[PDB]
């Protein structure tokens, strides 16, 4: 039985260009795709299917996994997986001591896909140097990566989990795309034991890492504490406070740019004053805490900005409206884009757990550069949306750790 | 002549229905030609006669052939095409020679009547109904519908290639060592077999094709190396661009120069160090295609330099999958990069150039990286792997820049090669403020409707100066104030600004810019021995800033 799937009215299916792939990945892809089609999960298609979505290969661990970018299709089915049914997000997942993530994407290969929808899942395996025509398939079953699959499999998932939920009321289990998020406050050993227990239920219906979200704390905008202070140091200080002021209600710089009078040499050392030293402390109190006045709005996109801090350090902020930081963080520790990619995956993962959606990223890197390389390090089964931007040199500085 | 291949299901866009276009009257010689053409086509199965049952119709007409005395049936599918579903695009692109493997013998087979040899979907045929008009439209016409892919219909190119690819598949799967490329009507076939055993492999293909409806002319008329293909000249184990003739002219039109550029750009695929900068600067501006553009001196010498390079033939080499690709890049006229890609030095598989400004302000290290990135994507498309690079930059130069810059970046495995001019950083800004260097607090600021600007500075050594700039922007004034401070200070100097914009520019360490001012500011930065640039919030009462802020 196939739950009929309708696109958003007035939109057509995706027609996205296949990126060029390396010989090594193409070959992995044919292997994978010939096996998938014997099994009848995908079928070869004719020219009368005009649609396309991008496909590539990653390492899940020496073994190729296939990854379809349904970012565009997802946008065009949206209404469906977001507001017809559509999986509700547990508010306490982010409060657990331990949450484990498990891949249950294999489950969707079981369920048939609505025939009048299959044609929208078309993808192409390109050939090197354009020497032969791409080989072309659509899906016959719920595809991994399409946000429709968990929405449709939803009904079967709560059935699979009911006894286990019934037996552990205080364990939280949230599905997102191809992953199951399972959280508890058990001690880590007892948590791992419940996970294996859960794996056994899953195992009877078809099926084959650890977060501690309650230890996620914000990265404050930090104010240096100095032995001695220069004009230059105080100006930097007045800058940073002035930015934090456009966000954090309460920030006061009055007593501080007091010290900065006239026309002093940048290297002149200027005395600390009480009411200044007090303004600096009182400002620290504020930067420590959540932003008074900022809330998640379930109907707006999440944005995530990242800044390259150098030396393997990256800073980030998540907001819906600019400067109203919902969260702020860092990521630490070779390869600039490898790191960026890890950082995006870390940030995406936290975002899924807290709000139950992926942010659109503002990436400090050359489009072409990122487009070339990111698949070299990607390990998630989802892909967030992203743009590319040039970090305003000051923003980098103000979020410096 | 009509393939037994299964048809592709077709249908019209979701809302729409088949065309119902009125046939206009034709002259009588034209009606005569149509009747005999269509009578030939009908006896061959291509079309067949229908009754007035069929609601749909599409205009036909006929034209005289090639100054000769034949006619060709033309059908106007405008409306059918507008009502027909979209298809998968045929080719994502065409192979590059540099990516081709070498073959002893090659043969081109041409599929006769390609489209009329592929059946058209039974359910869709009705929508192709056309009518041959009777004389003066007095009596009802002769009505036909297509049974095969019509010339000029929207789906024919896509359905033919797919058809040919299903049919080709077995032969391919059974002859992995022999290679076939399909493009439209033609089949290009390559083997490392010897002329005898290859021609035998051809016949098996031909007879396989014929088993499937597709006829091909024979072994008596099949051409020889070299082969002309997509603007290239292909030989068994080398390749080159088709012969490129640069005219001798005393007067060049806008049009002549455009053609001249295109041919040079084309030649640059395999001819090393072709430059078009000076010829391209001629195109800048608005001029008719017929108008004459006096070449400049630089442009006249470029054309000269190019004409030498093209003198001696050069060829490219084909790809050996078992060896790495090396890519080498050189600097040329500012913003121009050339590159070669080889597997054995220095037998190039191909060459090329890169010349693009990203942003208004770049430096050589940014440009080189963009070129590495562009060349890497090209290699993946052509060869399916990335090249080992050789680059005119010290590992230390690149390493200083990567960290200095706030943008993320990465280039594959590469090594230094000493091929001047070397790319480098021409200055570096101080990380920390400088002791014993004058601190200039600068500030520029315009009037939004007047466009009158005042730039200037105050100093901790009590020096100060303001100037009046005319018809400039608030942008340009903040930059002029930086320039001012660079001119009037010594070899060391700390500059304090309020312009995040100006900060952005300089902090990125440009060495090129569209801007005259910025190139001025750069010249100064080079000559200095220490510059520290710092930013402060505008009108937030910051000591030094307010002073030079009121005073403007
Ligand atoms: C067989 C062939 C002929 C012509 C044409 N014309 C053009 C193309 C694109 C061809 O296909 C291929 N040719 C070659 N090498 C090759 C070698 C020598 C010559 C010669 N002479 C031509 C092509 N390698 C491939 N992988 C493919 Br697919
Ligand atoms: Cl909230």
Swiss-Prot record, chain A:
Changing residue 101 to I: Confers resistance to efavirenz, emivirine, nevirapine and trovirdine. Residues 39-211 form the Reverse transcriptase domain. Changing residue 36 to L: Confers resistance to zidovudine. Mg(2+) 1 binds at residues 103, 178-179. Changing residue 203 to W: Confers resistance to zidovudine. Changing residue 201 to Y: Confers resistance to lamivudine, pyrophosphate analog PFA and zidovudine. Disulfide bonds: none annotated. Changing residue 150 to S: Confers resistance to lamivudine. Changing residue 108 to F: Confers resistance to abacavir. Changing residue 47 to R: Confers resistance to stavudine. Changing residue 211 to A: Complete loss of RT dimerization. Changing residue 182 to I: Confers resistance to HBY 097. The record marks 373, 386 as: Essential for RT p66/p51 heterodimerization. Changing residue 177 to I: Confers resistance to lamivudine and emtricitabine. A motif (Tryptophan repeat motif) lies at residues 370-386. Changing residue 358 to I: Confers resistance to abacavir, lamivudine and zidovudine. Changing residue 174 to C: Confers multi-NNRTI resistance. Changing residue 131 to K: Confers resistance to emivirine. Changing residue 260 to I: Confers resistance to delavirdine, efavirenz and nevirapine. Changing residue 99 to M: Confers resistance to delavirdine, efavirenz and nevirapine. Changing residue 109 to Y: Confers multi-NRTI resistance. Changing residue 63 to S: Confers resistance to didanosine and stavudine. Changing residue 208 to Y: Confers resistance to zidovudine. Transmembrane segments: none annotated. Changing residue 81 to G: Confers resistance to pyrophosphate analog PFA. This is p51 RT. It comes from Human immunodeficiency virus type 1 group M subtype B (isolate HXB2). The chain holds residues 593 to 1016 of 1435 of the full protein.
């Amino acid at each position: 039985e196939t739950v009929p799937v309708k696109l958003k009215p007035g939109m057509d299916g995706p027609k996205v260009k296949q990126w060029p792939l390396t010989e090594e990945k193409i070959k992995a892809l044919v292997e994978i795709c010939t096996e998938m089609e014997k099994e009848g999960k995908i079928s070869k298609i004719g020219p009368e299917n005009p649609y396309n979505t991008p496909v590539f290969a990653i390492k899940k661990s020496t073994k190729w996994r296939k990854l379809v970018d349904f970012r565009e299709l997802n946008k065009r089915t949206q209404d469906f997986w977001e507001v017809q049914l559509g999986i509700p997000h547990p508010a306490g997942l982010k409060k657990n001591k331990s949450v484990t993530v498990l891949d249950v994407g294999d489950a969707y290969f079981s369920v048939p896909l609505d025939e009048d929808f299959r044609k929208y899942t078309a993808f192409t395996i390109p050939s090197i140097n354009n020497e032969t025509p791409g080989i072309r398939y659509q899906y016959n079953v719920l595809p991994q990566g399409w946000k429709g699959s968990p929405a449709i499999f939803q009904s079967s998932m709560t059935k699979i989990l009911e006894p286990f939920r019934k037996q552990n009321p205080d364990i939280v289990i949230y599905q997102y795309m191809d992953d199951l998020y399972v959280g508890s406050d058990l001690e880590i050993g007892q948590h791992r034991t419940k996970i294996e227990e859960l794996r056994q239920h899953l195992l009877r219906w078809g099926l084959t890492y650890e977060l501690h979200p309650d230890k996620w704390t914000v990265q404050p905008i930090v104010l240096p504490e100095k032995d001695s202070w220069t004009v230059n140091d105080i100006q930097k200080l007045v800058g940073k406070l002035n930015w934090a002021s456009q966000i954090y209600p309460g920030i006061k710089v009055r007593q501080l740019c007091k010290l900065l009078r006239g026309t002093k040499a940048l290297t002149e050392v200027i005395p600390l004053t009480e009411e200044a030293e007090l303004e600096l402390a009182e400002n620290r109190e504020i930067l420590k805490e959540p932003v008074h006045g900022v809330y998640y709005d379930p109907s707006k996109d999440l944005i995530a900005e990242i800044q390259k801090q150098g030396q393997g350090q990256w800073t980030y902020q998540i907001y819906q409206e600019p400067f109203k930081n919902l969260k702020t963080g860092k990521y630490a520790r070779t390869n600039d884009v490898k790191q960026l990619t890890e950082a995006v995956q870390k940030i995406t993962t936290e975002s899924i757990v807290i709000w139950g959606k992926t942010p659109k990223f503002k990436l400090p890197i050359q489009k072409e550069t990122w487009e070339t390389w990111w698949t070299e390090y990607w390990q998630a089964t989802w892909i967030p949306e992203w743009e590319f931007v040039n970090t305003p040199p000051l923003v980098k500085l103000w979020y410096q750790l | 002549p009509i393939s037994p291949i299964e048809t592709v299901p077709v249908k019209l866009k979701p809302g729409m229905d088949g065309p119902k276009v009125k046939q206009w009257p034709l002259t009588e010689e034209k009606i005569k030609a149509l009747v005999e053409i269509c009578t030939e086509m009908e006896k061959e199965g291509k079309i067949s006669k229908i009754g007035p049952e069929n609601p749909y119709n599409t205009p036909v007409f006929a034209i005289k052939k090639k100054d000769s005395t034949k006619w060709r049936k033309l059908v106007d599918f405008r409306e059918l095409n507008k009502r027909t579903q979209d298809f998968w695009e045929v080719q994502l692109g065409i192979p590059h020679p540099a990516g081709l493997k070498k073959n002893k013998s090659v043969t081109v087979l041409d599929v006769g009547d390609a489209y009329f040899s592929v059946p058209l979907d039974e359910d869709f045929r009705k929508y192709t109904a056309f009518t041959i008009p009777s004389i003066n439209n007095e009596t009802p016409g002769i009505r036909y519908q297509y049974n095969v892919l019509p010339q000029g219909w929207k789906g024919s190119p896509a359905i033919f290639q797919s058809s040919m690819t299903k049919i080709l598949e077995p032969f391919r799967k059974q002859n992995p060592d022999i290679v076939i490329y399909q493009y439209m009507d033609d089949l290009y076939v390559g083997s490392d077999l010897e002329i005898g055993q290859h021609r035998t492999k051809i016949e098996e293909l031909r007879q396989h094709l014929l088993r499937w409806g597709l006829t091909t002319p024979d072994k008596k008329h099949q051409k020889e190396p070299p082969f002309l293909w997509m603007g290239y000249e292909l030989h068994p184990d080398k390749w080159t661009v088709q012969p490129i003739v640069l005219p001798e002219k005393d007067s060049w039109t806008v049009n002549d120069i455009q053609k001249l550029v295109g041919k040079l750009n084309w030649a640059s695929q395999i001819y090393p160090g072709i430059k078009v900068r000076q010829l391209c600067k001629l195109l800048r501006g608005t001029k008719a295609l017929t108008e004459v553009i006096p070449l400049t001196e630089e442009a006249e010498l470029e054309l000269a330099e190019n004409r030498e390079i093209l003198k001696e033939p050069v060829h490219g080499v084909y790809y050996d999958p078992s060896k790495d690709l090396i890519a080498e890049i050189q600097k040329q006229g500012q913003g121009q990069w050339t590159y070669q890609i080889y597997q054995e030095p220095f037998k190039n598989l191909k060459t090329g150039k890169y010349a693009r400004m990203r942003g208004a302000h770049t430096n050589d290290v940014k440009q080189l990286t963009e070129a590495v990135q562009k060349i890497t994507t090209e290699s993946i498309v052509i060869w399916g792997k990335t090249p080992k690079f050789k680059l005119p930059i010290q590992k230390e130069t690149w390493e200083t820049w990567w960290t200095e810059y706030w943008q993320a970046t990465w280039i594959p495995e590469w090594e230094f090669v000493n091929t001047p001019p070397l790319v480098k950083l021409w200055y570096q800004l101080e990380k920390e403020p400088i002791v014993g260097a004058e601190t200039f607090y600068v500030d520029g600021a315009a009037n939004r409707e007047t466009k009158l600007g005042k730039a200037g500075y105050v100093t901790n050594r009590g020096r100060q100066k303001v100037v009046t700039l005319t018809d400039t922007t608030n942008q340009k004034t903040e930059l002029q104030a930086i320039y001012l401070a660079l001119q009037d200070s010594g070899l060391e100097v700390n500059i304090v600004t309020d312009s995040q914009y100006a900060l952005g520019i300089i902090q990125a360490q440009p060495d090129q810019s569209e801007s005259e001012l910025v190139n001025q500011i750069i010249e100064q930065l080079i000559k200095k021995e220490k510059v520290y640039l710092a930013w402060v919030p505008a009108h937030k009462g910051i000591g030094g800033n307010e002073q030079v802020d009121k005073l403007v």
